[PDB]
Design a binder for this molecule. Sequence first.
Ligand code: HEC
Ligand code: HEC
Lengths: 159, 160
Amino acid sequence: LNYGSFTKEHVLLTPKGYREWVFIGASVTPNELNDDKAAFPEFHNVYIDPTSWGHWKKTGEFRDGTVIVKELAGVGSKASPSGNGYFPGEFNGIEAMVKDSKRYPERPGNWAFFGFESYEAKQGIIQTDETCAACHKEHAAHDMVFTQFYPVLRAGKPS
Amino acid sequence: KGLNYGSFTKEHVLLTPKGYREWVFIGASVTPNELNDDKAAFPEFHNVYIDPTSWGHWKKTGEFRDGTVIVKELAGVGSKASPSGNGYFPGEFNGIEAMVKDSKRYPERPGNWAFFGFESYEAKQGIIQTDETCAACHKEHAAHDMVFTQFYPVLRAGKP
Ligand code: HEC
Ligand code: HEC
């Protein structure tokens, strides 16, 4: 079963319940290491929909209909009883990408990339290939997903 | 009824959990070695999960039921720079820690939490820990019921 609901123009409605999908990894780009203004502030927690996770464990490929959500959160502090580093604060927003060879036949890898103005928006804004796919195409380890940073995906694909 | 996540020996020791990566992620933090005298206490990234039944209960109540299992997975820092900017990015898996709340199995431990260490992903079961080794820091400093919910935005957003 596909996990992305759409409008008529194949625009992605804001995903709901993605926090109960399969988490695949977290990174952090703090503002203070990026001239006080990270591109994606700051923590990033990333999820893949459960059906696509199932298909990934079998094939090590992203099926048609894969949805991946990147959730941004703030750095809430830099020191805790466990030591120094970065610790998350409040949610900041989300980004998403959807793979569909039928609805997006001419985008790189048949991926559409979406931004969201706020948590209350009812739908995403599809982006031009220049804005997001170009960087993913140029540097992602596998099929435009930065799986070099998702150890859940790497450990979970078939041997 | 809800499912029972985690299995236990007759001495009530948690068997090494399987499938916890399909549980509910509640937040990640990072204590890099280079920021902690080249040896962090829990190196380095920590990805945290709560079992799906306790997550269902937490959504309704905001408390940790009896039978709550939380798993903290450790991973190394893989790199400090990527096309998205400077920071910290995960590498390989290092190991796990876990805590289990059960007033029937652990009537005398603080909070009725049992803290477990694991010697490897290959171990059959965990090693339960003395109160000073784990529960002490957790009871003094965690925001809620010995769980550090100040670092679990999923938990804080999901409670009623
Ligand atoms: C993370 C991201 C994800 C998660 C899946 C993945 O491929 O990692 C999504 C759905 C997304 N972004 Fe992309 N992005 C970049 C890198 C290195 C990572 C992982 C490391 C981290 O989390 O910091 C990403 C790289 C880039 C980038 C390089 C200059 C650009 C311009 C973009 N990303 C742009 C976008 C988007 C355009 C608005 C967009 C919707 C993204 N990313 C979504
Ligand atoms: C994270 C942890 C978790 C996840 C649930 C939680 O309460 O956060 C578990 C299951 C666990 N550790 Fe504990 N721990 C500490 C802090 C600040 C955090 C969250 C921020 C982060 O990820 O860095 C924890 C603090 C401490 C601490 C203070 C010095 C000590 C002594 C311990 N933790 C000890 C233990 C354990 C004994 C070996 C053990 C099995 C833990 N923690 C498990």
